[PDB]
Amino acid sequence: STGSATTTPIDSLDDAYITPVQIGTPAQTLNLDFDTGSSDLWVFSSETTASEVXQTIYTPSKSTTAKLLSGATWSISYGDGSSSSGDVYTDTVSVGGLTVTGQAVESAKKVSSSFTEDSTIDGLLGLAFSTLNTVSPTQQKTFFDNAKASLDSPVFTADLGYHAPGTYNFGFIDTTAYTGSITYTAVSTKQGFWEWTSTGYAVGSGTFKSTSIDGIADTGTTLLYLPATVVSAYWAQVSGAKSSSSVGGYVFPCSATLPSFTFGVGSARIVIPGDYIDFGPISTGSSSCFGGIQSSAGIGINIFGDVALKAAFVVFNGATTPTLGFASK
Numbered sequence: 220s221t222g223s224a225t226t227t228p229i230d231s232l233d234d235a236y237i238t239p240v241q242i243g244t245p246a247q248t249l250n251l252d253f254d255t256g257s258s259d260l261w262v263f264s265s266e267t268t269a270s271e272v273x274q275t276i277y278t279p280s281k282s283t284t285a286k287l288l289s290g291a292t293w294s295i296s297y298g299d300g301s302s303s304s305g306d307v308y309t310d311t312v313s314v315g316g317l318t319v320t321g322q323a324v325e326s327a328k329k330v331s332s333s334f335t336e337d338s339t340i341d342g343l344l345g346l347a348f349s350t351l352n353t354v355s356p357t358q359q360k361t362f363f364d365n366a367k368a369s370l371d372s373p374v375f376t377a378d379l380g381y382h383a384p385g386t387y388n389f390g391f392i393d394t395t396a397y398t399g400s401i402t403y404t405a406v407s408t409k410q411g412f413w414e415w416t417s418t419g420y421a422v423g424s425g426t427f428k429s430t431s432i433d434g435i436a437d438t439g440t441t442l443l444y445l446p447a448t449v450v451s452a453y454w455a456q457v458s459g460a461k462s463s464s465s466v467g468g469y470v471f472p473c474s475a476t477l478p479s480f481t482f483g484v485g486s487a488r489i490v491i492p493g494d495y496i497d498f499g500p501i502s503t504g505s506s507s508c509f510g511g512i513q514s515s516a517g518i519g520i521n522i523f524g525d526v527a528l529k530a531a532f533v534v535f536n537g538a539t540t541p542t543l544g545f546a547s548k
């Protein structure tokens with residue numbers, strides 16, 4: 220089997236991307252943030268404290284296929300400080316026409332304020348490795364892990380758009396969605412992520428520096444977070460750019476024509492166009508824009524988030540020894 224679903228930016232800044240997910244019988248359609256940096260499928264629900272709901276909710280008692288997973292609970296927090304917790308059902312879940320039975324659906328009893336505040340995100344669908352799942356006492360498998368037995372190939376692909384709709388595919392590689400060929404690189408699962416080592420980088424039309432960059436492919440992070448020295452080298456080529464203590468990163472004049480940023484995948488190169496690195500105005504109508512490449516020093520891990528991923532066609536190869544593929548597009 221295969222599935223193919225459209226993923227859409229939630230706002231004008233490409234802050235996040237949502238993808239429809241059908242849960243239960245009859246199907247309840249929720250828009251979830253597909254997140255290759257975590258491993259829980261959790262939803263706003265009829266269980267969620269009412270004052271914390273502003274979203275479409277899952278009601279397990281309206282689904283004939285929902286089963287309570289007795290004794291199971293979950294609690295998660297994210298790098299940006301947000302959190303949620305609750306209890307666990309198994310139910311039928313479909314993405315893009317691909318159906319899994321027995322998927323753990325983590326029903327939120329409570330959600331943090333940033334979740335309440337974002338009307339567009341009805342929950343998360345984690346796509347990192349199942350070892351990061353937060354259900355206790357027994358961790359639960361991701362949607363991808365449960366799908367692998369039936370998929371035509373144990374893969375999924377991310378084709379995120381720049382201010383445009385894009386696609387998540389499960390079980391096949393669409394050869395018409397990219398140019399050139401895919402280059403694969405090794406993945407370490409020791410921290411539960413799609414963690415890999417980039418072979419280096421270049422700024423604009425300058426030289427490629429072969430300094431290894433260990434980081435994670437994370438569709439649930441907006442920006443590209445790289446080592447301080449790399450980020451400094453990038454913004455050195457932007458004459459109005461400076462680090463802003465108060466705003467929380469590099470800011471630059473919105474009228475700048477930004478250089479591209481190239482990262483290495485083995486011998487291959489993925490080029491992020493300059494305008495992808497313009498995240499957007501600090502506030503509507505500002506003359507200052509926030510950079511899309513920021514230092515990873517505060518977060519402690521390099522993150523190839525959406526600014527990077529949306530420049531590529533990305534293959535998450537979940538064979539027993541997983542790998543990550545990148546192609547230009």
Ligand SMILES: CC(C)(C)S(=O)(=O)N[C@@H](Cc1ccccc1)C(=O)N[C@@H](Cc1c[nH]c[nH+]1)C(=O)N[C@@H](CC1CCCCC1)C(O)(O)C(F)(F)C(=O)NCCN1CCOCC1
Pocket residue numbers: 234235252254255256257258295296297298299300301337343351352353437438439440441442518522
């Ligand atoms: C506006 C912004 C200044 C650019 S922002 O950083 O706040 N944008 C958010 C995404 C967002 C956009 C719009 C609406 C709501 C949320 C962002 O990029 N958050 C990252 C920031 C980050 C990463 N690292 C340090 N900081 C994040 O937490 N991403 C997680 C998923 C997000 C959470 C908020 C809701 C949307 C999904 C994440 O899962 O990708 C993660 F990898 F960063 C992470 O937190 N992974 C958790 C892994 N744990 C390990 C232990 O086992 C449990 C799982």
